[PDB]
Amino acid sequence: VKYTDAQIQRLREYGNGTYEQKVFEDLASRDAAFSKEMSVASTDNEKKIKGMIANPSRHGLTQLMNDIADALVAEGFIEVRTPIFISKDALARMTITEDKPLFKQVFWIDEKRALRPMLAPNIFSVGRDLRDHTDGPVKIFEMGSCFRKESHSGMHLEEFTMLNLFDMGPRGDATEVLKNYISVVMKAAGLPDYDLVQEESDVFKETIDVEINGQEVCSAAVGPHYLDAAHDVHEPWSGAGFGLERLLTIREKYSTVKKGGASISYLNGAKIN
């Protein structure tokens, strides 16, 4: 016998070990094991918490954001910060229009505005505007919260942190340039081993995704792209959107994506209550 799915969930809730591989001689020993591992997890949470109080630090997600951001600035990217609110028009330019099922999966603030489910709308707008002021590439990036109505999963959050980098009019082939920037981010994130895959997408038809052990940590694309007309873009470009919680979760080997980011139940992998 093994841990039940319910026991595995409670263990992952409190601990960041691996539990689904244990095998026991009978239910009695399985249950004794469950108590011992809950006790070990709680103790490890105590130790991490006490360690943070004695040796305070910036937040694990903030540290990752700073690590990647400084690497992108070094490559010539301007950091921008854009509103979390976006308009119905901005969504429509992504083809997220009012009669599509997807329209209802965004958090609406009123009849005209919603919480951004992605940074690309604002990034296209800012990048295009900056093109009015330079003849070279427009390189910008943002790191900020996005919001999506999601079903329960160990890798999905209603609020998650996107990194979106945008290189409009790059100095080379857009796809080769994109793979170069993906490499910069992944190395700066401490995750140099990854795979690139072509993945279907309603908004993009197909994306270039970054996967680690089959887990999506990025969707990317290159221009000239069919979305350019709606954004008044008329040049090649390289763009990529990473999920920072997912990167941090995989690197730190957190049992779930809810432990490394924004929370009032966890702090840097530790359960605090």
Added chain:
Amino acid sequence: VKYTDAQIQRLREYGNGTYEQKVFEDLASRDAAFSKEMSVASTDNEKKIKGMIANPSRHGLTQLMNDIADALVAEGFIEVRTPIFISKDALARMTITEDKPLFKQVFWIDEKRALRPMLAPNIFSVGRDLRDHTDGPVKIFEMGSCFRKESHSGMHLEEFTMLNLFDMGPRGDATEVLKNYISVVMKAAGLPDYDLVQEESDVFKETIDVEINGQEVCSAAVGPHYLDAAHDVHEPWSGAGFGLERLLTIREKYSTVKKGGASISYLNGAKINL
């Protein structure tokens, strides 16, 4: 004759000079001066965008956040990140209820959940949970977006960036400790010249506000406080919420708070479109 209230607004929205003090011999002299200052402003905008493209950098608001954050960590504060969503219950435990004006500024996501108008509810929760693990002060801070419905004002945004620091069970008089850590933040922000004032608050009854030239950049409170029972807090505490865009705007001498914050119309003080 002076610039009209509208002329000021327009000059401020493209430029970062100081126009409210200008005086003019007559309406003709005023009007000609409105155009030249528009041209001086547009030119400076362009130089700023061009300067940013040739010298790319972290965002000004981000640099200010990193400066204060590292200073607070150096004083023993743990950085925490909490969700932007908060429950109707959490708001109620802050006494943010139907009768309070702040309640009418709340952005609701559904009938049970809202965009946080402040970080305090989440900070109380995380700080009180950490008290179970230590016999000393619990020192935490968060920097993140808060949301409020606001009328047109050169120092209000619907989405602004709060810094909230929280010292529960401080070592010293909570009010004296509060003033010390206000000093740490203000100096880290490059704004060493400020004053402290007492102000009325519908949530805290009374706050200690930080002002620069009479402009509020922070509201702070101390415990024991009547909000403590609803947060299971049974000890003194020191708490302060800073408006980071207001700090950045005053230090950089931007004309309004919209120029240095989250925007698709401004970037680091410069207007990027018409």
